Design a protein around this ligand. Sequence first.
Ligand SMILES: CC(=O)Nc1c(Cl)cc(CNC(=N)NC(=O)Cn2ccc3ccccc32)cc1Cl
Length: 375
Amino acid sequence: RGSFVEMVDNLRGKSGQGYYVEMTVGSPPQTLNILVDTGSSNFAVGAAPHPFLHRYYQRQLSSTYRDLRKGVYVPYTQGAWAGELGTDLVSIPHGPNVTVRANIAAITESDKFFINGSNWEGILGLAYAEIARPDDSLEPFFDSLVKQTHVPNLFSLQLCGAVGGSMIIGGIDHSLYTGSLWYTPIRREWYYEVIIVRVEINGQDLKMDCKEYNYDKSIVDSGTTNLRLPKKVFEAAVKSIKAASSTEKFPDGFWLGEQLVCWQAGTTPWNIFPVISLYLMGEVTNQSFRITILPQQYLRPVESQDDCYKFAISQSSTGTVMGAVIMEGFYVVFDRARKRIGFAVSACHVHDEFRTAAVEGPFVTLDMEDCGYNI
Ligand SMILES: CC(=O)Nc1c(Cl)cc(CNC(=N)NC(=O)Cn2ccc3ccccc32)cc1Cl
C-alpha cells in the first residue's frame, strides 16, 4: 500500500488496558510488549518476575547492556515503580528500520503499575525530557531515535477501540484517516500540551471561561483511558450530558464511574447519549477547529448476553487529559518537528449509521492566547 505499510496494525491491546507495540531489546534479541504512552517520558521494562508479567527483560543475557549505576523511581497518582538505569540496543520490528542505543529503566519493584491480563511488560514514554525521571538529563527514547538516525521527528497514532491500531514512526499513513488533518500548537514541550478554547455537548456551548478548560494544563495522553476534566468543567459537562440524555434515567454513581449500566446484547441506545466537542487553538490567529466524539468513545464496554458500560469521562485535579476516549476517534499526528498536533477522523473509529466522529473547521475564536494557565 503506502510506503509505511509495514507499520500499519502494529498496535494491540485489551480495551481499557492500554495499547502496546513490540520492541526488541538487547543482544541476542529480547522482544517485549510495550505500552505506548504519550503522557510520560521514560522507557522502562519489567526486569524481574511479577504475577502479571508473562515475560521480562533479562539484563544478564544481553551482551550489549550497559549499567548506568543509578536507580530510578517513577510515581503516578494510581501506582508507581522502581528500578535501575542502563542503556541497550533497541529496535521496533514493526517500526522504523533502525536500531538505536537507548536509555532503559529495568523495573525491579512496582505497586499497581502492571495490569493483569493487559499483555504488556513495559512502557514507552513518548513525551519530552522535561518530565523524564530522574531528571531531564535522561534522554527519552524518541529523542535518541531522532538524534542517532535519519528518522523524521514525527510519529502518529491511530488507536482503534472496541483492540489494535497503528503507530507510524517517521511519517503519516494516509489510509489511516479520512478528510483533512487539522493542527493545534504544542504549547510547550514537556507533556504534549495543547489549548482547548471551547467545549460543546450536542452543539451546546458549556459557556465556561476557557481558562477553566486548561487549568492547569491540557494534554494528549495515550497512556490513560479516560477523558479527564478539571473539577468545575467535569461538573458542568455532567450536568449538560445528563440534560441531553434525559429521556433515560441513570444513577448518580454512573456519572461518577462508580456504577455500570448494562444493556441486553446489541441494544445500546447510542442515540440517546450526546456527542462531545472540544475546540482547539488553530495555527492561524483567531482560528480554531473542533474535534467531536461519540458515546462509542466515552462509554466503555467492560469485561454473556449483557453489555455493560462505564462512563469514561472523569474528574481531574491535574488539568484536562485527552486519553484514549479522545484518541480513539482520531488519527493523531505528533508533529514534533513543527511543534504541533494534528487530528483527523480515524478510518477505524467506532461509530454507527447515524453519527460519526468529526474534525471540522475553521471557526473564529478570539483571545485564545488568554486560555492558557501560567506558571
Ligand atoms: C494500573 C495503571 O493505571 N498503570 C499505569 C499505566 Cl497503564 C500508565 C501510567 C502512565 N500514566 C499516564 N500516561 N497518564 C496518567 O496517569 C494520567 N493521569 C494523571 C492523573 C491521573 C489520575 C488517575 C488516572 C490517570 C491520571 C501509569 C500507571 Cl500507574
